[PDB]
UniProtKB/TrEMBL annotation:
Residues spanning the membrane: none
InterPro entries in the record: Nudix_hydrolase, NUDIX_hydrolase-like_dom_sf, NUDIX_hydrolase_CS, NUDIX_hydrolase_dom
Keywords: Hydrolase
Pfam families (UniProt xref): NUDIX
Annotated protein name in UniProt: MutT/NUDIX family protein
Domain Nudix hydrolase: 2-129
Assigned protein family: Belongs to the Nudix hydrolase family.
Origin species: Burkholderia pseudomallei (strain 1710b)
GO molecular-function terms, A-Z: hydrolase activity
Length: 129
């Protein structure tokens, strides 16, 4: 019926980005930015923090707006619009908190990215560098 609101985080340290590999559709088997849906009555920035905490077990500090991703896929019947925030700083150490949803995690150099990447990640990366 109508477009849904998502969000994401581009977590970058030392010219490397933190990517997580999805097990489940959509975009199953792709490496991508952490993120997810914004909940009813939740500010978008509190959603980025919560969702990265839920997925990676870390707490973002000082995340700034980077871009907005259109995820339009008429064939599979979905439309998400997803603001993506850049973060250089956080507390805790990243881990796959939910083994049912993700099966790998890593720091990758922006010139040597893994494949395949989620659409959201390709668009985000065109902004960063």
């Amino acid at each position: 019926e109508q477009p849904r609101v998502g969000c994401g985080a581009a977590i970058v340290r030392d010219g490397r980005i933190l990517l997580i590999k999805r097990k489940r559709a959509p975009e199953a088997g792709c490496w991508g930015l952490p993120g997810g849906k914004v909940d009813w009555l939740e500010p978008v920035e509190r959603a980025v923090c919560r969702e990265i905490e839920e997925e990676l077990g870390i707490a973002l500090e000082r995340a700034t707006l980077l871009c907005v991703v259109d995820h339009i896929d008429a064939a599979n019947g979905e439309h998400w619009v997803a603001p993506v925030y850049l973060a250089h700083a956080f507390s805790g150490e990243p881990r796959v908190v939910e083994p049912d949803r993700h099966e790998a995690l890593g720091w990758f150099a922006l010139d040597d990215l893994p494949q395949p990447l989620t659409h959201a990640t390709r668009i985000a990366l065109e902004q960063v560098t």
